[PDB]
């Protein structure tokens, strides 16, 4: 839509993904108009980790999907689990904070 597909492929690498995610509020479109709904956002990037090394992931970016699966409607424990499940070749789609 106006999103960035960022991939944290490891290819047999030790280097962790090294990022955190958190609960937030995102605004989405509806028949009622613009509504505040629960979202998932990037908390911070760990120095040395692959997430930082891309230069595309940034703090307060919204997680849209994880490897093709939209995270809307899902809790933070679920999304975390989706990401660590796919941790070898993780593909995040985000809406950049700016």
């Amino acid at each position: 839509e106006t999103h960035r597909r960022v991939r944290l492929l490891k290819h047999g690498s030790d280097k962790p993904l090294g990022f955190y995610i958190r609960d937030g509020t995102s605004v989405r479109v509806t028949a009622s108009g613009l509504e505040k709904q629960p979202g998932i956002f990037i908390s911070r990037l760990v120095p040395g980790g692959l997430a930082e090394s891309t230069g595309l992931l940034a703090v307060n970016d919204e997680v849209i999907e994880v490897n093709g699966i939209e995270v809307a409607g899902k809790t933070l424990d679920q999304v975390t689990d989706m990401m660590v499940a796919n941790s070898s070749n993780l593909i995040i789609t985000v809406k950049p904070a700016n």
Binding site: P16, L17, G18, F19, Y20, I21, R22, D23, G24, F41, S43, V46, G49, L76, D77, T80, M83, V84, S87, L90
Partner: peptide
């Protein structure tokens, strides 16, 4: 806002 870590050492 509560947070959780994806693969952190």
């Amino acid at each position: 806002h509560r947070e959780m870590a994806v693969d952190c050492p």
